[PDB]
């Protein structure tokens, strides 16, 4: 299938003393590969995947230089937003930024995005045309006006359509053994008797990558969504992911029910029964 590169940035003001906490992370698909923390001792962009260590000092200095420019933009943004919204200097506030590009299975440009939030609310986002903006309110309209005058959008379009996808291809090549390998779910099933009448069945999917997964229950070959639970997909810690789903069933009727697992790393979707 497709792939993506995405950076995520968070800036948090500290009003009593000093500058804001700033954290950046880089992802290729579901794999963190770089990071910056203002509170860390290095004050450098740092690798978090083996295949990015391949890169020389010049890369690391460039990335450190850009990440600190991002840091400063956000520092400035917090002040600008404080005055736009008439807030006092007593409060801690948050700024968040996410941008990135997607490519399809042919590794050619598909989409790009860039969105920005203030205290966890939409502020301004780049439209899919990569030529116009969506401001959520009148503060963000002023920004929209500034950025139209300054042709920010065109700068971003150059990056997203050009450089972003070039470096994504590079990363996918240099991280071939992991980034282009899918791991299939390791699946099993547990039972839990709550009373003599009521049994709970749980379908587990473990140790799979990428994160995208679908777990559905059937009864006598038909989709059941009643009396079922499905947890948020959660990370294992070792690069892979986990997810379970449960259904409550009458005790003695367990054989009627089936869990159905769809994942990119499975040629045919799986079926389990107790």
């Amino acid at each position: 299938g497709s792939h993506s590169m995405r950076y995520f940035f968070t800036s948090v003001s500290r009003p009593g003393r000093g500058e804001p906490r700033f954290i950046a992370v880089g992802y290729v698909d579901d794999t963190q590969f770089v990071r910056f923390d203002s509170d860390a001792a290095s004050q450098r962009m740092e690798p978090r995947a083996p295949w990015i260590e391949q890169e020389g000092p010049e890369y690391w200095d460039g990335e450190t230089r850009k990440v600190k420019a991002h840091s400063q933009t956000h520092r400035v943004d917090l002040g600008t937003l404080r005055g736009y919204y008439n807030q006092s200097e007593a409060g801690s506030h948050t700024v968040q930024r996410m941008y990135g590009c997607d490519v399809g299975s042919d590794w050619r440009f598909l989409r790009g995005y860039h969105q920005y939030a203030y205290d966890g609310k939409d502020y301004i986002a780049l439209k899919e045309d990569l030529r116009s903006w969506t401001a959520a309110d009148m503060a963000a309209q002023t920004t929209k006006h500034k950025w139209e005058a300054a042709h920010v959008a065109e700068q971003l379009r150059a990056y997203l359509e050009g450089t972003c996808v070039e470096w994504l291809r590079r990363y996918l090549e240099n991280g071939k053994e992991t980034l282009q390998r899918t791991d299939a779910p390791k699946t099993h099933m547990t039972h839990h008797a709550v009373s003599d009448h009521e049994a709970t069945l749980r379908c587990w999917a473990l140790s799979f990558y990428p994160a995208e997964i679908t777990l559905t229950w059937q009864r006598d070959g038909e989709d059941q969504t009643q009396d079922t639970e499905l947890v948020e997909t959660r990370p294992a810690g070792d690069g892979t992911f986990q997810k379970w789903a449960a259904v409550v069933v009458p005790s003695g009727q367990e054989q009627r029910y089936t869990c159905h697992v769809q994942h990119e790393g499975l040629p045919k979707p799986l079926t389990l029964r107790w």
Partner: peptide, 9 residues
């Protein structure tokens, strides 16, 4: 590879 520019609001 980060964007080379981060234009402020």
């Amino acid at each position: 590879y980060l964007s080379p520019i981060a234009s402020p609001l």
